[PDB]
Write a protein that holds these residues in place. Structure first.
Motif, PDB file in Angstrom:
ATOM      1  N   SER A  19       0.877  -1.177   0.000  1.00  0.00           N
ATOM      2  CA  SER A  19       0.000   0.000   0.000  1.00  0.00           C
ATOM      3  C   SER A  19       0.901   1.209   0.000  1.00  0.00           C
ATOM      4  O   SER A  19       2.114   1.050   0.156  1.00  0.00           O
ATOM      5  CB  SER A  19      -0.919   0.012   1.213  1.00  0.00           C
ATOM      6  N   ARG A  20       0.343   2.402  -0.213  1.00  0.00           N
ATOM      7  CA  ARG A  20       1.069   3.645   0.042  1.00  0.00           C
ATOM      8  C   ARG A  20       1.458   3.720   1.518  1.00  0.00           C
ATOM      9  O   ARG A  20       0.636   3.393   2.380  1.00  0.00           O
ATOM     10  CB  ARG A  20       0.200   4.822  -0.307  1.00  0.00           C
ATOM     11  N   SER A  21       2.693   4.136   1.821  1.00  0.00           N
ATOM     12  CA  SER A  21       3.120   4.217   3.241  1.00  0.00           C
ATOM     13  C   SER A  21       2.142   4.951   4.124  1.00  0.00           C
ATOM     14  O   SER A  21       1.859   4.484   5.222  1.00  0.00           O
ATOM     15  CB  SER A  21       4.528   4.759   3.456  1.00  0.00           C
ATOM     16  N   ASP A  22       1.592   6.066   3.662  1.00  0.00           N
ATOM     17  CA  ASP A  22       0.635   6.796   4.508  1.00  0.00           C
ATOM     18  C   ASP A  22      -0.631   5.970   4.846  1.00  0.00           C
ATOM     19  O   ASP A  22      -1.418   6.341   5.706  1.00  0.00           O
ATOM     20  CB  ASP A  22       0.329   8.213   3.956  1.00  0.00           C
ATOM     21  N   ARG A  23      -0.797   4.822   4.201  1.00  0.00           N
ATOM     22  CA  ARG A  23      -2.006   4.005   4.403  1.00  0.00           C
ATOM     23  C   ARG A  23      -1.726   2.662   5.081  1.00  0.00           C
ATOM     24  O   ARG A  23      -2.639   2.000   5.571  1.00  0.00           O
ATOM     25  CB  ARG A  23      -2.722   3.778   3.053  1.00  0.00           C
TER      26      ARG A  23
END
Ligand SMILES: *[C@@H]1O[C@H](CO)[C@@H](O[C@@H]2O[C@H](CO)[C@@H](O)[C@H](O)[C@H]2NC(C)=O)[C@H](O)[C@H]1NC(C)=O
Ligand SMILES: CC(=O)N[C@@H]1[C@@H](O)[C@H](O)[C@@H](CO)O[C@H]1O
Ligand SMILES: O=C(O)Cc1c[nH]c2ccccc12
Ligand SMILES: [Fe+3]
Ligand SMILES: [Zn+2]
Ligand SMILES: [Zn+2]
Length: 341
Positions: free
Chosen positions: A258-262
């Motif tokens: 996933s995207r790191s922020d997620r």
């Protein structure tokens, strides 16, 4: 609030995702793309949260800032003191398989044979084999090594796609998703099994799962392990029981990115989801099983016991490991520091 959007690759994975969506009470919903790259893009844009990826694609994703969250773990005998989620991943064995009846075909006599690959850019189907071939060949002309292949994701009109068969209407020849007949671990093996190709670049488990009555699929039901051989790098041929000493490389397990922020949120939902739909989850086999699909490996490999946490919060280079990452870089110079989108 805590809702996750999964990216399904092609019509059949969409169908499974939707069932999952339904049984989860829209705790997971679905997005669809025709290829894994498209799903990577959807994740970057924030239109999807996660998908499960082969090591080759984790490399792509990784350069675009995406991160490994949870890895597949299969049936193991070692590390038996430990629960699955907490148990470290072994890695799967990349193999080259052939018919026994096809006597005298070794690793050294592959030039001009017909080949079956999982898809362009995957670990066992592409990066390992072609990495080795470019190496031994001293040439980037890997499109000219085999007479004919099926390499989903290559140019439909190149000889890399000549052996691919598209879908039931014969549409979609060579698409890198399961609409293609000879696509993925099961497609590539089926490709060998029907004698379309001479060699199939799959992983060890693909042979065991599709022979000796393990698969009920019409093409595989009469398939017998003793009719296959593994090609070793030393020029020999071994039964399929010698994988431990006749493989091309050990590969890092498919992982959810996933995207790191997620990442944190995606992790939390997934662990709760497998509690429900995993190997002995509350609602499997009663209502729905996340890790089942009739040998089609949709969203996940059918042999997944559970999704495991990752010790040491590894980055994507750490997750894939240095030996693997260098091999992909060396291969990529054939056809350094930039996201590919
Ligand atoms: C090849 O893959 C097979 C199947 O994934 C592995 O064998 C199985 O392993 C578990 C634990 O050792 C057994 O309990 C299963 O019953 C086996 N499955 C089958 C279908 O035989 C095997 O370990 C792998 N071999 C290598 C060299 O990686
Ligand atoms: C089927 C399903 O997943 N339902 C869940 C429920 O169990 C949980 O209390 C909530 C928060 O996670 O989200 C919803
Ligand atoms: O866990 C995996 O399957 C991948 C993996 C993480 N670090 C590694 C180092 C060397 C070889 C493989 C791996
Ligand atoms: Fe793979
Ligand atoms: Zn080895
Ligand atoms: Zn680290």
């Amino acid at each position: 609030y805590t809702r996750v959007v999964w990216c399904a690759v092609g019509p059949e994975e969409q169908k499974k995702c939707q069932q999952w969506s339904q049984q989860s009470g829209q705790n997971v919903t679905c997005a669809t793309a025709s290829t894994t790259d498209d799903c990577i893009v959807l994740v970057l844009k924030g239109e999807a949260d996660a998908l499960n990826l082969d090591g080759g694609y984790i490399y792509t994703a990784g350069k675009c800032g995406l991160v490994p969250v949870l890895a597949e773990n299969r049936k193991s005998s070692k590390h038996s003191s430990l629960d699955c989620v907490l148990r470290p991943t072994e890695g799967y064995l990349a193999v080259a398989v052939v018919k026994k009846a096809n006597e005298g075909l070794t690793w050294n006599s592959l030039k001009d044979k017909k080949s079956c690959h999982t898809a362009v850019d995957r670990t066992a189907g592409w990066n390992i084999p072609m990495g080795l071939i470019v190496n031994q060949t001293g040439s980037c002309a890997f499109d000219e090594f085999f007479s004919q292949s099926c390499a989903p994701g290559a140019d439909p009109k190149s000889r890399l796609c000549a052996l691919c068969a598209g879908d039931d209407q014969g549409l979609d020849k060579c698409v890198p998703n399961s609409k293609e007949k000879y696509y993925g671990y099961t497609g590539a093996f089926r490709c060998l099994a029907e004698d379309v190709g001479d060699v199939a670049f799959v992983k060890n488990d693909t042979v065991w799962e599709n022979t000796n009555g393990e698969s009920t699929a019409d093409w595989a039901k009469n398939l017998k392990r003793e009719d296959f051989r593994l090609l070793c790098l030393d020029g020999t041929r071994k039964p399929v029981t010698e994988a431990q000493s006749c493989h091309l490389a050990v590969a890092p397990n498919h992982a959810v990115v996933s995207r790191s922020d997620r990442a944190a949120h995606v992790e939390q939902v997934l662990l709760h989801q497998q509690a429900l739909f995993g190997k002995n989850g509350k609602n499997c086999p009663d209502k729905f099983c996340l890790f089942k699909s009739e040998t089609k490996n949709l969203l996940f490999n059918d042999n997944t016991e559970c999704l495991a946490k990752l010790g040491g919060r590894p980055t994507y280079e750490e997750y894939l490991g240095t030996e693997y990452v260098t091999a992909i870089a060396n291969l990529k110079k054939c056809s350094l520091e930039a996201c590919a989108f």
